[PDB]
């Protein structure tokens, strides 16, 4: 039996809020990255440092530690870029037209054109960020969406029932936040459907982005870390 089932709705939110990773800074070279090498270097260095916080954030996700170690490896391997992207998207909400990769690293789609193939992913990321801003997405909703991605993005690739019970538990938590916020019953199941449909687009962006990642790795554009390389090879 897992402790996540016994947790209440407000206790589920606080555990997810306190487990939040911190917003990390980019390397402080004052040059605006307009090359393919410097761009990918800044993002790879940032992504590698975030992955270490993500591994420790996942451990503090109710129900995650109750899985086998192999299952924990599978879920994080499937969802890691999804987790990073929805993090980037949430940080960029209050900067329309920009992507806040870091407080000291802001990019627009013009800089995305300096890496052949990066601009298509940027536009999707910007549109996801705008859609979050139009929905007035809340922080408590964001942490619920991010952990849903962790538990759901690798469930179909004993343990399946546990994940589905926690996924249902998070569903009650989302509705709880919407009911606490004063939404009507129709507004609650409509907003719920909207939030989960965006997750389909975050998966799409992750797969299209994973394509270039294990293709620029084959081109050796920037020396990748072993950890980021093992997270990449997990996607065939």
């Amino acid at each position: 039996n897992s402790l996540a089932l016994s947790l209440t709705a407000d206790q589920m939110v606080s555990a997810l809020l306190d487990a939040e990773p911190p917003i990390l800074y980019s390397e402080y070279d004052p040059t605006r990255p307009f090359s393919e090498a410097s761009m990918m270097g800044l993002l790879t260095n940032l992504a590698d440092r975030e992955l270490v916080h993500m591994i420790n954030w996942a451990k503090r996700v109710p129900g995650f530690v109750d899985l086998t170690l192999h299952d924990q490896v599978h879920l994080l391997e499937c969802a890691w870029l999804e987790i990073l992207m929805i993090g980037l998207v949430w940080r960029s909400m209050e900067h329309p037209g920009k992507l806040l990769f870091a407080p000291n690293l802001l990019l627009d789609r013009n800089q995305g054109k300096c890496v052949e193939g990066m601009v298509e992913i940027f536009d999707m990321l910007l549109a996801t960020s705008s859609r979050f801003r139009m929905m007035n997405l809340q922080g408590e909703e964001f942490v619920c969406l991010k952990s849903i991605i962790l538990l759901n993005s690798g469930v179909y690739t004993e343990e399946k029932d546990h994940i589905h019970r926690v996924l249902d538990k998070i569903t009650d938590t989302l509705i709880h936040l919407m009911a606490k916020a004063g939404l009507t019953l129709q507004q609650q199941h409509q907003r719920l459907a909207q939030l989960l449909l965006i997750l389909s687009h975050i998966r799409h962006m992750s797969n299209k982005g994973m394509e270039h990642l294990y293709s620029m790795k084959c081109k050796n554009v920037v020396p990748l870390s072993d950890l980021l390389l093992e997270m990449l090879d997990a996607h065939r």
């Binding site: 270490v52 591994i55 451990k59 170690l69 924990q72 490896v73 994080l76 391997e77 072993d226 950890l227 093992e230 997270m231």
Partner: peptide, 10 residues
């Protein structure tokens, strides 16, 4: 796997 080791720390 490095991810194996990092998921075991403490």
């Amino acid at each position: 796997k490095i991810l194996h080791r990092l998921l075991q720390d403490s």
